[PDB]
Amino acid sequence: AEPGIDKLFGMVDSKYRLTVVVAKRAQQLLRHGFKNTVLEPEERPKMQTLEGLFDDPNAVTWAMKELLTGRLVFGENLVPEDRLQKEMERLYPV
Amino acid sequence: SHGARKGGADTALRTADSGYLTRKLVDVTHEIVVREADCGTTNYISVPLFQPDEVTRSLRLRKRADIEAGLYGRVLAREVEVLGVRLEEGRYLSMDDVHLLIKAAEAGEIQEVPVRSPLTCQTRYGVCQKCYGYDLSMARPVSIGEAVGIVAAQSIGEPGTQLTMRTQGLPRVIELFEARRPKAKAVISEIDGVVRIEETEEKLSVFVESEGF
Amino acid sequence: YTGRGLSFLDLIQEGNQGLIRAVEKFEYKRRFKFSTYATWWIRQAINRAIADQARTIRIPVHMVETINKLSRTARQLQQELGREPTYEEIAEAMGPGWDAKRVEETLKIAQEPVSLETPIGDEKDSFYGDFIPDEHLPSPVDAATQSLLSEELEKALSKLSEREAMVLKLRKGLIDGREHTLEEVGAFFGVTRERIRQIENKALRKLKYHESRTRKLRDFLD
Amino acid sequence: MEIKRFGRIREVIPLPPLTEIQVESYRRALQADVPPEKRENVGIQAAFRETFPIEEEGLVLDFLEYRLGEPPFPQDECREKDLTYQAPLYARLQLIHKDTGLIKEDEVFLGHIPLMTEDGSFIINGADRVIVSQIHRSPGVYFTPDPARPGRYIASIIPLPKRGPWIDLEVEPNGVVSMKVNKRKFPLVLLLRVLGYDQETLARELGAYGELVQGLMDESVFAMRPEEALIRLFTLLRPGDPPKRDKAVAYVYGLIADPRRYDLGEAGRYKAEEKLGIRLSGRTLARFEDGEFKDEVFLPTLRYLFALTAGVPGHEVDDIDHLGNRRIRTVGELMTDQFRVGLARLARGVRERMLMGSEDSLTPAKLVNSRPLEAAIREFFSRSQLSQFKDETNPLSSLRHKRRISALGPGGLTRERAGFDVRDVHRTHYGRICPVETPEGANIGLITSLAAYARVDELGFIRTPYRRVVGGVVTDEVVYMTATEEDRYTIAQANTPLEGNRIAAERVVARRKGEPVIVSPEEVEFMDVSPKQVFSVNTNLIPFLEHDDANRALMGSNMQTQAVPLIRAQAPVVMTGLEERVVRDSLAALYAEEDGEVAKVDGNRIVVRYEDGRLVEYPLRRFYRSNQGTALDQRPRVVVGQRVRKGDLLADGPASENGFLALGQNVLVAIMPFDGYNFEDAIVISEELLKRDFYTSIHIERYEIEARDTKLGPERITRDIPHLSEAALRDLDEEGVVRIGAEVKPGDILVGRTSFKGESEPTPEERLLRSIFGEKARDVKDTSLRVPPGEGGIVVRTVRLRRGDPGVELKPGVREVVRVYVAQKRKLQVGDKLANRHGNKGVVAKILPVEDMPHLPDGTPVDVILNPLGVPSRMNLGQILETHLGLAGYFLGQRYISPIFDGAKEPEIKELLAQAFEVYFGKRKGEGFGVDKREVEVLRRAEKLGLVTPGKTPEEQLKELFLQGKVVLYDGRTGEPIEGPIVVGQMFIMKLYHMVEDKMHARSTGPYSLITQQPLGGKAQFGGQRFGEMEVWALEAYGAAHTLQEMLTLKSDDIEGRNAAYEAIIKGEDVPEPSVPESFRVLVKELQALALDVQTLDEKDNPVDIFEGLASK
Amino acid sequence: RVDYSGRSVIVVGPQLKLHQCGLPKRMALELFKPFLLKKMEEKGIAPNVKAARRMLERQRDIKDEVWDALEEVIHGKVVLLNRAPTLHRLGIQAFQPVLVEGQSIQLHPLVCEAFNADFDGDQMAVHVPLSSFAQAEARIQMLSAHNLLSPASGEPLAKPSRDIILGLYY
Amino acid sequence: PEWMILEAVPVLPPDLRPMVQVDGGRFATSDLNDLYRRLINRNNRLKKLLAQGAPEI
Amino acid sequence: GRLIPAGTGSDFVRFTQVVDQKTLKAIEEARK
DNA sequence: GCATCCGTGAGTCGAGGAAGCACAATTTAACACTTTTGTCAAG
DNA sequence: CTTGACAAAAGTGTTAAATTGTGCTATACTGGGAGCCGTCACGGATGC
Ligand SMILES: [Mg+2]
Ligand SMILES: [Zn+2]
């Protein structure tokens, strides 16, 4: 099973809300090239390559780990989508 | 070889019927989804814990498997006080709660359990979270937005192949789901009253007598 | 005449048309009965309708007669020789002006189209249309490589000057229009034809130099 | 390896020719050997005598005789050139002018009749095909009880299929008998009056019954004259048509009295005579003579129906599913029927041609148009359901296919129109149709296999042989009898003990009318020839059949067909005795015609000097590709100068060892779970099998290309393919084809072809690229042939056929065709499917090294590990007994032949195991070795389990374990013994045709359909996987809305969506939001074509255009 | 019919985890072809996408780094295994692919009862979810290790089976 | 109600009833093309018969 | 071919928004 | 109230691919001739 | 940047050859041919 899957299931009132949050966070990470991560450099997921350890390119795993840390605020009608995208671009240009 | 070929032909002509019944069940309940947490309905169903056995002509405790299939993962509509334990209204019945209810019935303290069921659900184009109960795949209350209609249809239609075909078995299930009139249909009393048998060699007649009817 | 590509009632109606024509053209002064003259027109109309309406791809009446004569000759030679004749014998028997190539082409033309819904197999769950790929619309790979080629060409043209890039796009149809001739582009820029040709050649040479120094555009040539 | 044979039943007769059902019937149909004057009125000769003479009504076209010429090409030439193996058929016809009195005779060429090879299969269009016999209801008169109303019976008159309408006779509640023809019901009194029957005759014949005869008397019809009655009958049958005596009598004669249109058949006439006790002059319901109709069968049928209704003792109802009432149409009957249809069409064409155009100057050649006959024959031999593509994976496969009986086909039952009545094993199937063997699934009970000793008679009724028993002694006289004749005698069982010829058992198990009974030897009238006659060829090849459940013996027999030949195939240790007969009758091996000496032995041919001195050269079929892709080769088994007796083996055929059918390998099998690699029927094999090349086969694949003529220009097959490097063209010779012997991998070019490109301007980007690189676009493009993914091998053959070649009839517009045969040597690998004769099947899940497999105490590792849990559920105990017997043979160095139901028993296997253990442990004692400590621990554990007697010496306990078939088995990894003794033996395992190499498929992007633009299907076409309704339901149940949307739009038919998704993925971006599928657009357009306005609206009910304005004017 | 879909015969894998399946290398290469082309473009294996596709077209032209790139691609991703008929909702299950040498799919024994799949010659189909939504749905909702109880009755459906029960009982 | 009787028969787009040329040069067409051809032939024949003053039968 | 009104496509959970701490704080500071 | 004709339905994958004849109306390959460039010298 | 000479590439205008479509056959012909068949159950009208 996915690491910390029980906590992720228990943190939301519906598993599909969990899936939506994870997918949206993964796409947000992909769009900005993982520069908007809330993970410390010691917490970033790593993959083992012949050259050496590298950052995990799977955005879903990154989103799941970030949501496990608990530093992500998720819900309905938080901020306007256009304003949120503009602010995220301003903080992390891509 | 006669019996072996009969069984093979039965399976061959039964798989198609089971698949077609599954398709019907999917296509009739494709719109049923958990659409709200609670619809606020006050109706319920009283799931019976005792079956009226006719050979003894008395109420006998049903099997544990039947009670579990009829009560596990269901919301109590009314508060139930059994064996010093108070299960409040809106409490999901887990396996421990089902076993407690079974023990209470064995102690002769409760005859039927009032639970919320989809039959009494007032949600339009679907059901509610508090009426469905647990998501049996996770042993926790059903998540809002699950396609419980498709799950129900698949669950009913999956063991159709395992049912024996040889008014019994899969054809019985098919005629039950289609609400068909059985060929050897039983005779029921239209109104309540006292029964009177007038068995005669010429004709057999049964009379239901009331105050004026 | 039934069984020659047209239904019975269609043949009857076409014969009715021929009968109407015969009534129009019939003459009773010759003292011949109406059946004798009407039969010619009825069979003519039926045969014309069979020639013009018994095939999904219409074939002219003269070519239909040619195909029928070829089939009759082939059948006669087949029954005479006790085997299927080759194209040489059929062409020889048809007459002057006929060779094996013409017979083969006529037989190829006489091939009726095959239905797309013909079942294959004991079960009726397959059709010809399930085995015919669509080769008209571009495949996803083709669209992707076209987009990549367009992007790479646009990036490569950035190295060119503002005027040279515009001249090359005009001369190669990159503005979605037909490739503008040298005079058209020159009039657009107010320049003579020779200078337009010279600047286009210079820009093409510069692009060749850049491609040689980079080799980031050769794979799309195929 | 000496062969020990078990059994006590002595067969008085040998097995009949297993292919006689296909061969003798076609020999009777053709009659190409009997002289024309001695030909009987059967088959195509009967068809000729039926349709001919043709009368214009004074021109007569009469038929005198027919002959068949020599085939234009041999079988090998037809196979190589994709021709049809056929013989020219000429007919001798005479034209007689009745008025003139002149006769014109000439031989007309009717066409080509396909010929049957010696093995019993046809070669149609270069492909081997087999005509499957069809079981159907025998024509005649039947009397079935009415299910709707008890106590009443209905008579059915059934002619040959498509040879007349079925007639129904019923007793109506009013008492008036009703006749039903072509769904039209009328009073039978009218038609009976048409046959000139008076009231007195009916009163005297049918009056000795109940009120039925009184109900049959209607003065309205009886007073009517026969002519007026016939007119009224015609009016009732066909309304609207004007009442004319000539037309009415013609219609009635064609309906119930015309031999050319109504044919009851020889079987139908025989059944009618047997049932009703009458003698029909012909095969028609009525006889039209002297301008009047005479009754043939209606009156006896009505009399029998009335007597059955009354309840006379001597009359009984007929069983529709009774195998005596069901007959078999072989290849001969079906071919004769199709030839009759074609000849009727030819006669119609002649009749419509002989009445118009130069009547005085006519010849039979001009009138006769043979095209309809050839068209019908080719349609029957190509596009018919019963003409199946030959299954020749192994000789047993073809042998079974030739002996298959199908209830489906033209004029027969249908897969989903068939109930339990036709699919059940009737009591009369004993000894005629194999009960166990049938294709499980939707076709269970509809396709069966003919029994071993069963043979189809002249009339089409299956007969079985029985030994005549008179006076309590069994004689050598054998009677071949059908089910209806079988029901009249008490037939004993083949296993009844005999003291020579006298029956010794006082209580004999016998059959009476299909039911089991216990009788005395004096009451025994017939005996079974052998237990083998009840089962077909496949089931007779399963040893210890009596210990296998029928449902699993079915699978074993079916999978015996699918075993592929192996380069090191060896005969099973435990046999039944039919392997030699199967090989001999399958015509796969090569045998000497008579006594002689072998002069020359070679891998290509064998030259033999017979006693008379003549040199006979037999070519050897070498590495010929079968229909299923397997390699069929014959390996010589003789040496130069070796003397051979008549019938001796000369060359082993495919899947054979010294004339014995060898479909697999005899491998050391241990029955025990192994680390979960045996889970759910999975099989574990040792690498030692691959080391010595066991289960290694040769498979040949054929790749075909065609160079044609195109309006853009003719496609040329050449080595100079544009825009290709020398590395890709390394294996291509100067002619553009791959050199023979070159190894080809997926993506490599087999034959090089360049096709002229369509005249079209290029895209502006491509033009700019060409201008930059200064490369002028060529006029041709690569359209060569490349090896599909997952295939390849060694190119072994190249065949190039060109237009104008002798006998090569290429399709019009095709310049040439090139075929490449590439052979690959496939070894056993993970995912390949193995099986055995007892139905135990599974895919190889692990290939362990030799040092990891469990090994015997002498150091011999096991080769295959089987899961024991497959035994108790499947109830196939025969594999355990075969394993025990194989262990005994392996340690004794001998093979065994145990016939089914009479063969090796438990005491015999136990004494053989005793001898095997004696030699096995005496060898160890002689080598100077006692009992292993691990063996001692295993013996202690076993005696704790009750497997061995406590208190015995270790040698005696080991002997007891060996007698139980179990040995002390060590573990190859730990070295410690398995805590319990393990059943280790030698078992015969076959490698099935289903291999993971041919089944693995994958696809990202590929071809798409025409209309719906969805991906194609099938590995050959490189298509995607079908995501049907049930998968969509599963996705909905999971609630994976986005995944379902992707699979419906992005990955299936959203053209713009899929293109954008692919572009985003190759650019490292995320796929975009999907759009409306093309399938919904097709839906909308088709609904509009049905004049239905389908409009898609938005929240405000405004129309929404999903076509982006492309369909808006 | 869907793109990015394959099919192959299944074999039992006892060493796999409950959330893993053995995807053949060739099937993974063909199914993940666009992702593999992108990864090869990222590294030095190929100059662009067209060159990478041409390299992958011919079997003998594939180098050894292509397999490493493919292993890098499938990291974290999951594939849906399907077996017809899909009688109930667990007939399609998400597994984490593991590259294996061979041509047969390695299936975990515990899910077999859920799939109603034995190893007498069964075939299964592999589907590849593409976007972040599809991957999240497969990994969170459709994962084999996340569906341990049968939705029909609530009893466990991925439970010890024939050989496991035999050994534990013994 | 009068819309239930067709006065103008709609015609499906030809790509949904394609007449394609296979790689072998043979033409493959759907049955809808044949149905449309029959309908058009009968309609044109009716028009010609009406223009020629054909009798009532 | 639309998003089904069940599972992740249900209106109850389809409009859920995930946002980090830093961007949310920036939005609040720039708005209020 | 009941017998009867008509219409609809009956599992999923995969692997199976028979006139010519004359004559007038329409199209087009073959040339012949201006028209339009594509390129080359001249700096 | 311009100013003239050349050498094909494409378009215009006949020219008949090839192709295509319509008209016409005058002893007398005057209503079709293939089916044809092993299923059960359930709406649902269609009448008696
Ligand atoms: Mg299986
Ligand atoms: Zn509710």
Q: How is chain A split into domains, by residue range?
A: 1-94
Q: How many whole angstroms separate alpha carbon D282 and alpha carbon B132? A: 76
Mapping DSSP to helix (H, G, I), strand (E, B) and coil, where does residue D542 land?
coil
Residue of E137, C141, A14 whose CA lies nearest to D1042 = E137
Strand partners, C19: none
Gap from D243 CA to H14 C1', in Å? 59
* Full residue range of the structural domain in which residue D279 is found: 139-318
- Could you tell me if D238 and D295 lie in one domain? yes
| Cα gap D433→D425, rounded to integer Å | 9
| Cα(E122) to centroid(ligand 1), Å | 5
Output phi, psi for A51, to 5 deg.
-65, -40
User: Chain E partners of D1001 at a C-beta cutoff of 8 Å?
Assistant: 6-8
For residue D420, the chain B residues in CB contact (below 8 A) are 6, 9-10, 13
H or E element at residue D618 = strand D615-619
* DSSP secondary structure of D154-185: EEEEE-STTSSPPEEEEE-TTS-EEEEETTEE
C-alpha G12, offset from chain centre = 12
Could you tell me which residues come within 8 angstroms of residue E44 by beta carbon, excluding any fewer than 6 positions away?
none
Determination technique used: cryo-EM
Same domain, D681 and D820: no
The verdict on D364 and D242 lying in the same domain is: no
Angstrom distance (rounded) from CA D558 to CA D393: 13
Q: Residue D919 class from Cβ within 10 Å (0-12 exposed, 13-18 middle, 19+ buried)? A: exposed
Shortest Cα distance, chain B CAs vs residue G25, angstroms: 30
Partners of D535 in beta bridges: none
CATH assignment of the domain containing D648? 2.40.50.100
Alpha helix positions (H), D490-645: 550-561, 579-585
Two structure tokens written together for A91: 């903080």
The secondary element (H helix, E strand) that includes residue D287 is strand D286-289
User: 3-state SS of chain C: helix, strand, coil percent to 5?
Assistant: 65, 0, 35
Q: What is the CATH number of the domain that holds D917?
A: 2.40.270.10
The annotation status of C125 as a binding-site residue, yes or no, is: yes
Q: How are beta strands D153-158 and D140-145 bridged, if at all?
A: antiparallel
CB D393 within 8 A of CB D564: yes
3-class secondary structure, B37: coil
Residue B73, classified by CB atoms within 10 Å of its CB into exposed (0-12), middle (13-18) or buried (19+), is: buried
- Which residue stretches of D562-704 are H helix? 579-585, 687-691
Report the distance separating Cα D193 and Cα D200, nearest Å.
12
CA D992 to chain CA centroid, Å, is 17
> Of all helices (H) and strands (E), which one includes residue D388?
strand D387-389
Q: Count CA within 13 A, CB hemisphere, residue D1059.
A: 16
- Distance from the F48 Cα atom to the nearest Cα atom in chain C, whole angstroms: 9
Q: State the CATH number of the domain containing residue D421.
A: 3.90.1100.10
Pull the structure tokens for residue D35: 């002289």
To which residue do tokens 């961007």 refer? Answer: G23
Surface-to-core class of residue B164, CB atoms within 10 Å of its CB (0-12 exposed, 13-18 middle, 19+ buried): exposed
- Determine contact, residues D585/D653, Cβ cutoff 8 Å: no
Helix-helix angle C193-214:C140-157, to 10 degrees = 110
Size of interface C-E (CB pairs under 8 A): 16
* Ligand 1 centroid from CA B15, angstroms: 15
Give the residues after which the backbone of chain B is interrupted, taking a C-to-next-N distance over 2.5 angstroms as a break: 166
CATH number listed for the domain at residues A1-94: 3.90.940.10
- Which CATH class name applies to G15-32? special
DSSP secondary structure string, D7-44? Answer: -----SSPPPPTTHHHHHHHHHHH--SS-GGG--S-HH
Tokens of E2: 């869907």
**Binding residue per annotation — E163?**
no
Which 189-208 positions of C have CB less than 7 A from strand H?
193-194, 197
Residue of D1006, D188, D587, C133 whose CA lies nearest to E4 = D1006
Q: Do G7 and E137 touch (CB under 8 A)?
A: yes
Q: Is residue D157 part of a domain?
A: yes
Residue D589 contacts residue D656 (beta carbons within 8 Å): yes
Total structural domains within chain D: 6
B12 and D549 within 8 Å at the Cβ level: the answer is no
CB of C21 under 7 A from strand I? yes
d(CA C138, CA C156): 25
* 3-class SS string, C140-185: HHHHHHHHHHHHHHHHHHCCCCHHHHHHHHHHHCCCCCCCCCHHHH
CB D661 within 8 A of CB D654: no
D521 and D555 belong to one structural domain: no
Disruptive mutation site among B15, B150, B158 for chain E (greatest number of E CBs within 10 Å): B158
**Resolution, angstroms, 1 dp:** 3.2
For D481, the enclosing helix (H) or strand (E) is: strand D473-481
The neighbouring-strand residues paired with D643 are: D597
Strand segments, DSSP code E, in D760-887 are 780-782, 785-786, 793-802, 814-826, 833-836, 842-848, 864-866
Residue B93 CA to residue B71 CA, distance in Å, equals 7
> What type of residue is D151?
G
Statement to judge: residues D345 and D419 lie in one domain: yes
Q: Is D60 left (phi over 0), alpha (psi -120 to 50) or beta?
A: beta
Together in a domain, D30 and D146: no
Chain E residue numbers with beta carbons less than 8 Å from the beta carbon of D867 are 163
Measure the N-to-C terminal CA separation of chain G; round to a whole number of Å: 42
Q: Tell me phi and psi for residue F30, to 5 degrees.
A: -85, 165
* H or E segment to which residue B141 belongs: strand B140-141
Q: What is the DSSP letter of E148?
A: -
> Which residue(s) pair with B176 in the sheet?
none
Distance CA D166, CA D184 (A): 11
In a domain, D1080, yes or no: no
- By DSSP bridging, strand D683-686 and strand D842-848 are parallel
Q: How many Å lie between the alpha carbon of D1058 and the closest alpha carbon of chain G? A: 13
The D894-897 sheet, strands edge to edge? D2-5, D894-897, D574-575
Q: Of all helices (H) and strands (E), which one includes residue F40?
A: helix F31-51
Strand I proximal to D162 Cβ, under 7 A: yes
* Residues D988, D850 within the same domain: yes
Q: Which residues of B are documented as binding site for Zn(2+)? A: 39, 121, 128, 131
Please list, residue by residue across D473-492, b when 16 or more beta carbons sit within 10 angstroms of its beta carbon and e when fewer do.
ebeeeeebbbbbebbebbbb
**Cα–ligand 1 centroid distance for E12 (angstroms):** 12
- Helix and strand counts by DSSP (H, E) for chain D: 31, 59
Pick from D960, D975, D992: which residue ends a domain?
A: D992
Task: Please tell me the distance in Å from A33's CA to the nearest CA on chain G.
Answer: 15
- The answer to whether strand I lies under 7 Å from the CB of residue C12 is no
Radius of gyration of chain C (CA): 33
Task: Domain B44-116: state its class.
Answer: alpha beta
B52 touches strand H (CB under 7 A): no
Assess contact for A84 and G17: CB atoms under 8 A: yes
> Which 8-state DSSP code applies to residue D1025?
B
For residue D439 the two structure tokens come to: 């294709």
Contact E34, E19 (CB under 8 A): no
Query: Which tokens belong to D566?
Result: 């192996």
CB atoms under 10 Å from CB of D130, counted, come to 23
Q: How far apart are CA C56 and CA C51, in angstroms?
A: 11
C182-187 contacts, C-beta under 8 A, 24 or more apart: none
Is D595 among the domain residues? Answer: yes
Q: Which residues of G touch A82 (CB under 8 A)?
A: none
Distances, alpha carbon D755 to alpha carbons D705, D719, D810, in Å? 13, 13, 19
Handedness of CA D819, D820, D821, D826 (dihedral sign): negative
Q: What is the distance between the alpha carbons of residues D635 and D602, in angstroms, rounded to a whole number?
A: 9
Any idea what the Cα angle at residue D729 is, between residues D723 and D730, rounded to 5°?
145
Task: Name the nearest CA neighbour of B61 among B73, B48, B47.
Answer: B48
Chains that touch E (3 or more CB pairs under 8 A): A, B, C, D, G
What gap in Å lies between CA D399 and CA D656, rounded to an integer?
14
Question: Which tokens is D1069 given?
Answer: 């971006």
How many Å apart are CA D535 and CA D448, to the nearest integer? 11
Question: Is C219 labelled a binding residue?
Answer: yes
Check residues 325 to 344 of chain D and report those whose beta carbon is under 7 Å from nucleic acid strand I: 326
CA of D1018 to C1' of H17 (A): 12
Residue with token string 């830093």: G22
Rounded CA gap, E122 and E136, in Å? 28
- The CATH number of whichever domain residue D271 belongs to comes to 3.90.1110.10
Strand I contact residues in chain D (168-207), C-beta within 7 Å: 182
Cα of E18 vs its chain's centroid, Å? 12
Backbone angles phi, psi at B60, to 5 degrees: -125, 150
Cis preceding linkage at D53, omega within 30: yes
Instruction: Please answer yes or no on whether D425 and B5 come within 8 Å at the CB atom.
Output: yes
d(CA B58, CA D67): 89
Closest CA to D1039 of G3, F37, C146: G3
Q: 3-class secondary structure for D922-954?
A: HHHHHHCCCCCHHHHHHHHHHHHCCCCCCCCCH
DSSP D523: G
Tell me how far the alpha carbon of residue B32 lies from the centroid of ligand 2, in angstroms.
Answer: 12
Would the CB atoms of F6 and D1091 count as touching at under 8 Å? yes
Peptide bond into E85 cis (omega under 30): yes
> In terms of DSSP bridges, do strands D615-619 and D664-671 run parallel, antiparallel, or are they unpaired?
unpaired
Cα-to-centroid distance, C191 and ligand 2 (Å): 81
Whether the beta carbon of D1030 falls within 7 A of nucleic chain H: the reply is: yes
Same domain, D669 and D520: no
Minimal CA–CA distance to B198: which of B190, B207, B185? B207
DSSP-H helix ranges across chain B: 2-28, 64-71, 95-106, 129-132, 148-157, 170-177
> Which residues on neighbouring strands pair with residue D656, listed in sequence order?
D661
Q: Which of residues 292-321 of D touch strand I (CB under 7 A)?
A: 320-321
3-class DSSP state of D58? coil
Choose among D444, D446, D451: nearest CA to D403.
D451
Q: Which of E9, E8, E62, E11 is nearest to E33 (CA)?
A: E62
Report if CB D137 to strand I is under 7 Å: yes
User: Please, are residues B66 and E153 in contact by the beta-carbon 8 Å criterion?
Assistant: no
Whether D242 sits with its Cβ under 7 A from any strand I atom: the answer reads yes
Positive or negative, the CA dihedral B111, B115, B121, B126 is: negative
Of the candidates A1, A26, A59, the beta carbon closest to that of E19 is on: A1
Going from the Cα of E117 to the center of ligand 1, the distance in angstroms, rounded, reads: 6
Longest CA–CA span in chain B (Å) reads 64
Q: What count of CB pairs under 8 Å joins D to E?
A: 247
Residues D88 and D126 in one domain: yes
Question: Minimal Cα–Cα distance from F10 to chain C, Å?
Answer: 20
Shortest CA distance to D638 belongs to which of D698, D585, D598? Answer: D598
Question: Alpha-carbon torsion C135, C136, C140, C146, what sign?
Answer: positive
Q: What is the DSSP letter of F13?
A: -
Given a contact cutoff of 8 angstroms between Cβ atoms, the answer to whether D779 and D756 are in contact is yes
Helix (H) or strand (E) holding D221: helix D219-222
